[PDB]
């Protein structure tokens, strides 16, 4: 639950799966910054009606995208380098020349 500003601001390029499901949140570019990414998919989880409705700081993603992208039934929205590590396994860090 914090991760460095510098680290925030790394430009990444999402997988196809990622990408596809940043897209369809309003999303549009190719390249992001990771706030974008973390900003997005917070969107699609409140769109998807993933969040726990009993607001038990869980996040339910079996047999959606989401479950697929990451690799998990559920994780906590408490965890924020562990959500970083699931993301970071579904996209390209830019090179910077
Ligand atoms: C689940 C709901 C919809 C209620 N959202 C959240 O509670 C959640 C959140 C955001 C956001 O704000 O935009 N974006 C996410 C993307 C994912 Cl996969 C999971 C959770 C979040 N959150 C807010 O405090 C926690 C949070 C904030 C960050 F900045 C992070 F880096 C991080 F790992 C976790």
Avoid: W
């Amino acid at each position: 639950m914090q991760i460095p500003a510098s680290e925030q601001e790394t430009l990444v390029r999402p997988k196809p799966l990622l990408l596809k499901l940043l897209k369809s949140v309003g999303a549009q570019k190719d390249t992001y910054t990771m706030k974008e990414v973390l900003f997005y998919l917070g969107q699609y989880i409140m769109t998807k009606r993933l969040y726990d409705e009993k607001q038990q700081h869980i996040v339910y993603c079996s047999n959606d995208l989401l479950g697929d992208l990451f690799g998990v039934p559920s994780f906590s929205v408490k965890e924020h380098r562990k959500i970083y590590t699931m993301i970071y396994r579904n996209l390209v860090v830019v090179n910077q020349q």
